[model samples]
Target: GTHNQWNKPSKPKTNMKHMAGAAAAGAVVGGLGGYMLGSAMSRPMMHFGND
Candidate 1:
């Protein structure tokens, strides 16, 4: 003889607004930093190709 049992799992809750706001802030900061770094490096890095 054999017996089987099954149980359903409960779903977890999340705060969507908080997560979205954090992601948006991170993206803005990352993009701004990249732009600034690229601008600063553009002039100094230009000499590599002329030689």
Candidate 2:
């Protein structure tokens, strides 16, 4: 379950208008954010084994 306080978009932007640049920037940002989030979530869980 999630809340919308920081989830909902209050404004819209032309995503396709700058598709090339947007895709590159978004990919980098998403990769970094995913790495950080995965690190945080795995720190407390014992589901996976570490090498």
Candidate 3:
């Protein structure tokens, strides 16, 4: 099931500046989203989950 969801290949290289900016932005946003989502979900799953 998990393998079926990973069909896409790696992305092509692009401008360094643009790529760096995108990566940085993605990291920041992903971090924030993960934190918020984890906090929100943890309360409900704490009793049954290890995370």
Candidate 4:
């Protein structure tokens, strides 16, 4: 015998406060920008080159 069981909505504890936002876009943008503006000027932070 086989059966399927599921439950939801009972504990609807959800949040989207910077927890699941477009942080990646910022990380990629800011991470590179911030690093380049200071740390990278000399060599460049996160400077991934095909080597």
lDDT of 4 by residue, 1-51 (tens): 999888756768864442432323222223553445443223334422443
Candidate 3 — which pairs collide?
Answer: none
Please give the lDDT score at residue 47 for candidate 1: 22
Best by TM-score: 4
Q: How many residue pairs clash in each candidate?
A: 0, 0, 0, 1
lDDT of 2 by residue, 1-51 (tens): 976666677786743332232222122233543445442222232222333
Clashing pairs in 4: 40-44
Candidate of highest lDDT: 4
- Model 1: residues >4 Å from true position, as ranges? 11-51
Write the residue-wise lDDT of candidate 3 on 1-51 in tens digits.
355555666896654332222221122223543445442222222122233
Q: lDDT of candidate 3?
A: 0.35
Instruction: Report clash pairs, candidate 2.
Output: none
lDDT values for all models = 0.38, 0.37, 0.35, 0.42
Q: Rank the candidates by TM-score, best first.
A: 4, 1, 2, 3
Give me the runs in candidate 3 sitting further than 4 Å from their true place: 1-4, 18-51
User: Worst lDDT window (10 residues) for model 2?
Assistant: 18-27
TM-score of each: 0.17, 0.16, 0.13, 0.21
